[model samples]
Target: RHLKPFPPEFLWGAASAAYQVEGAWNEDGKGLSVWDVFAKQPGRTFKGTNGDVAVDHYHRYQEDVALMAEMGLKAYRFSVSWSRVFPDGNGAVNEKGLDFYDRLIEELRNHGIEPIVTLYHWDVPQALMDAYGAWESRRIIDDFDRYAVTLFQRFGDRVKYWVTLNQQNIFISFGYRLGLHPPGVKDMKRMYEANHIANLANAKVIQSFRHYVPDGKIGPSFAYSPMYPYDSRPENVLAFENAEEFQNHWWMDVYAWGMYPQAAWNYLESQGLEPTVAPGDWELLQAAKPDFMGVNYYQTTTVEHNPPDGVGTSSGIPGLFKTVRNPHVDTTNWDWAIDPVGLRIGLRRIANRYQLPILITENGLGEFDTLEPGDIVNDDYRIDYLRRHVQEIQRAITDGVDVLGYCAWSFTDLLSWLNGYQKRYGFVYVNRDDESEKDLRRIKKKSFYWYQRVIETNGAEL
Candidate 1:
């Protein structure tokens, strides 16, 4: 269990998306993002809850940053609202919106906390969706490049690390294939087309980063659920391989290798669901090599051989595999599988496959944290979850994975998208929830002090 200390420059950090935390949705020239419209729909989000005043980080970032400094946080990863910079999705820049981030970067720098900025975190400006069907159309590539280039020009000097897309697989699959996110449609063909377009956009932005911010590091954050076979059966192992090639590598291979896996593409072609790839797409992807792989590992998946007539639905691109529960693992309240060893497995796999440095952009526990009457939140469960995960990451480091950092899922209690605020994941507790916005106070949880010590000792305490 005794692992070497983390590299001297390891980034002990926390992360949050703009839409989930910055709640001044319409303030200071901010435009409406798809989440702003999606959350307002009746029955769409939990309890009809929205992020209208989400922890009010837009106004309270200074206090939040101060707390981060107190915690000795070495890095803070956050995203910028695209609509906030260009209200209409393209054209003139909103200096006011840019001003907000400028101040934020300065504040983080003032506290010696390295700023890791994400360009897109699933909050496409609604205007883009209404204008050109967003990622479904090819027109988005150019507009997205412009928006990303604008950020690089404006803040790249201060922001050394950048994430091009937060989770392309989640957003595309949920929005276009599952009808659970904005611009919702449940057509398999459209999903393939939209995801291809998103791939191009992500590559183009990373391509632009090379020219705009040559010294900065950039990559897309992938939500990786490492897969395992249901049992020792050969059929189940093959099924698990199919799931890996189709689900994980579909997006990652494109990012890292500039091409999709041959078997997965053949399956898509066999089903008449292959995305249209223009002549220059491969070249662009190859040229835009990322400095690292932004991994968002929360759990591992177990799959078995699913018969053609077995519970798999073709409504989402002719499903070839199905997932089963791992009997050995526990679960979160939301049913997310908890497997710390899977983190080490995934990091090792990615290291072997891509040979790129890995940065854990998101990993944390989401639970119902109780606030004691005396303003204390004893979240020992969260501390335990993080401790186990951190140990696995250390194991990964010892296994020869070139790990750059580990950024927890969030820095504060923010909106949980479809789950509202009850699914808490933060070292600091916010006072707002689904039905109340009482005082909007921030209290340091027990895990906060634990993390502070972890940071102070550079992973030695863990």
Candidate 2:
């Protein structure tokens, strides 16, 4: 490999979603989000728990930022709750909501940490959802544009690093097609429509970013897991292509090329499901090219063709999808395949196709950790997971990928949006629960010290 894993200036940090961490939902007049509503469903979340008080990060951000600062985090990627800013989606601005983020960003700046702000992270305002089904109507484009403009006007100067949308493809798929997430609906027709609307919204906001925050950098944080054929069969290879077209390229192409892949669009049309794009949508997409591609790589997905009459429906697996275990790779507690080289392949693909610098916004292992009696967590698994991924990142860097930085999935253990608290992904573990809030104490895990040293040495020691 021509390049090492990372340079001294490469960002070594962590990330967290808004709803998953911030718990003071309505404390400061913050409006409800679709997640707030979805989690209330009978069995939407694990253990019937909601992120109503997730690790109490809302009220405890100072402490949390302090932890990141102590860890020598070069950057911290976090999302801003849109509902908090404009309670009802988009209307009168909410000062309290804006102030909350202003303080949070200030805290990061004070701690000498760069802040990468994600504008949308799947926490849409429930008011918008209730009023017009959120992301299902053409009106969402304007509402989202207005909401994003408010953030750019308020905090854009302080935050030069902006992520326009977080995992637009995943949230749309899980929300509409899988029916496992917010505004849960299992209709491919509506799913395609909403997914298109989301793409429009993303482009509109990114376009606005170019004009409003011209000096700032902006991109979408994609949940990218490159696909591999489950076996050597030709059908399996076709499955890999099918998944990539609809799953990965479907979104990235819109960002980079300003249009959906013709094959994917044709397939959706064949199913009588297509997302409607407006007259000027193509121009908007073309005008709003991202400065980089933020990739959230976790595990690589393997696929084999399911018979037409077999488990090939939108909801493939009984619950998630037709998931198959990769015998060559290990598995996490959540059954996510652990393939470090997947990161390499995923990065190379993004660089070759998009030709954009990449930021590994989220990548880590979610495990069931035990706090030993003496407060020591011998989480060799966590360390090993990161170590191997870092190695692959180095490999990708040498493969001619303009890798900017890498931020592990999370800094402190907070809420897992759907999986609940037990699927822990944090360097500093926050002792909390699914049903009740504990002291929310911050306990640095072994990885915390390991990452701190890794950053200090610029990825060479690790």
Candidate 3:
């Protein structure tokens, strides 16, 4: 009994990003985004596969929505491309872009599926990047707020779940510190400064959300990986604390507590890279306290004391950190630690600290699935991964965390940011290789039917 969810209100939905799923990059007066520009780089993506025509979801949304409805999906989480809404990042609203969402929202409502709209999911307009270096400029805070307020005003009455920023820490880490994402730069100082601006932007937009959508809920989807020290020595223990200060608490403390972690801030100040907050920024961040904490829990990380000349500077893409396996945990193909229990651990930690509801926004494995003859995809490994995760969620609910819902990382096969299409994370596998545009057609995998039953029973018999 304790393993069951709270009630039937638990929303089980699939997630997607506009750039990854909807491929109308230049259609309907849509402006170019940083992803559109970055993907065109000579060797940015795997086999140079881009989302220029991703799944064609932008044009075939009706058909896709019908598929979701037919599958009895209760909620659909998607992002609104900033360039689509405001082609130039700010100023005149693009009516064509607004109209597209108008129809998408209406379609979701017609099918009795809730809409969870994410404002910024790393798809910043290229115009903004060109003008002011994107997140590095403080002016983006005002621009983001104005843009978000417009959406809240138009759709607040119908839209109840609003995710202000999707994986800010991830994007900043990848884009600046890692040099694996758009506007890719590998500088510690720039990463710290740009991250501060992103926090301000997220806090400002969340502030606007509270005012504009009084009855709705809002939060940032944080990429949280509960860290552990390799051993019980004091040095390793301090290493765990350092990990918390730099990675997890750096963003969570700001969004939930409206202030940066003291140690992290002091360290940054010592390094002469402190982010200057405006006079009113703190007030706005605190006032816009999240109704929930949207967490994208992929796996947990293990930390050990690194000497001054120890770990080399690396990040996600080909230059990512040289990962080592955790002795106490299993591993995934993508080198992410396999820790289902960490999800429960993370929920308990967030619940104990912030006392806010938790939503699993993105959690799935990226693997190389074999698509045999007759379009059959046997991905039992993926199924086992999710089944164990759902079990952990049930245990978390039993432990008294106010768990809201879960949205898997992806619904259909789409392009991975750096690894590209080969590292697929989807239930419905799209039949296309890394470098070929061979009939980009959709085909349901074994996990589709497995997830359909999981959603239908509300995780009762899992």
Candidate 4:
């Protein structure tokens, strides 16, 4: 029996982003978010489906929180809409915007559930984009810090955990390099520059978090997919190291150690894609190290050696390694490789590297769930996916990793960014599809009751 017991304080939680769940795009002094503009573009999202009326969580959070209480959830990780709080991204507080989270935090507390707030989860206020190109400019650093300070002062006493940025690597790469996201641009130099600014902005907020909420813990949510060598060949092993340096460590090193991976930096500099680090930026980033590491582990990727003249990844460029399919792992409907053991591998790597308590901030299986008779969602695949991963987490804990908690990717079925609502990842499935927002009803999936019992036994039953 290598498995260790899940500690009594191991948090059982679910997560949701404001844009993906909250549907009140223009309600109650709410200004337009970048997504508000981006989603309207003709071919941006699948089947032209946007989050305009997504699950209507903006109007029905009370009902949602009640469901969490029923699940015996210990925590709930959700983001605040930046525009919902500061309609222009800075200057003049939106009382109505702050009021929403005020109520949300209170509701979570009433149920004995800890509220883990995510400061930014890809929801940039469109006003700021219009004024100064949002993340592209240094002005946003000040704006974001101010927003963090405001939240800390208002919700600090009650909310003790804050996630400063959710997937900075994702938003930056998708937005700049791929042009799939808002303020769409396709330039490596610009992406690196903007990403540098985001790191600074994140560090400033964490610094402010300390002053405003001295007792609280804060960190950024990193999307990490462990890199593996496709074969035992020395070339593939070296390629795997390169992949880890450029892909995984590039973002995480900055968060944990406040420095870019040296090899990755040199490689980018060789291609003239490196961003200029302003004076004192390094010191600030180093000084504001997070209390814990928030990781979003979805899957692991295998890499093979790629020559400099060869083709690059569809995900991104940096041609030392090419990602390949894992022969041993099963695949999802969406082609995401299903590998539960990767969770344990990723956690141990993080623990050894950062030496910080690791929080599994977002991990779930997205699948095409069938709605059966009488409001039933028979999603056993999702259950199997989570169960194996949870078991791997126990294994990691047994291996002496400081695994703090697990917050599943989502609480309820919400809109996926590229794909539509048909791709679901939730314990509670929302009764809506791409074509219609049919009543926005919430039906409990089989996984809900399973998770309830798992939490009750602290994973002993799982």
RMSD, every candidate, angstroms: 1.6, 2.4, 2.7, 1.1
Error of 4 at 313 (Å): 8.0
Error of 3 at 178 (Å): 1.9
Candidate 3 accuracy as lDDT: 0.84
lDDT of 1 by residue, 325-346 (tens): 7889998877788899999999
Clashing pairs in 4: none
lDDT of 1 at 203: 89
- lDDT scores in order: 0.90, 0.85, 0.84, 0.91
Model 3 pairs in collision: 315-320
Q: Candidate 2: lDDT over CA atoms?
A: 0.85
Residue 72, candidate 1: how far off, in angstroms? 0.6
Q: What would the C-alpha RMSD of candidate 4 be, to one decimal place?
A: 1.1
Give the Å error, residue 267, model 2. Answer: 1.4
The Cα error of candidate 2 at residue 74, in Å, is: 0.5
Instruction: State how far residue 401 of model 4 sits from its true place (Å).
Output: 0.9
Superposed model 4: Cα runs more than 4 Å off: 313-319
Off by over 4 Å in 1: 313-319
Model 3 TM = 0.95
Off by over 4 Å in 3: 313-324
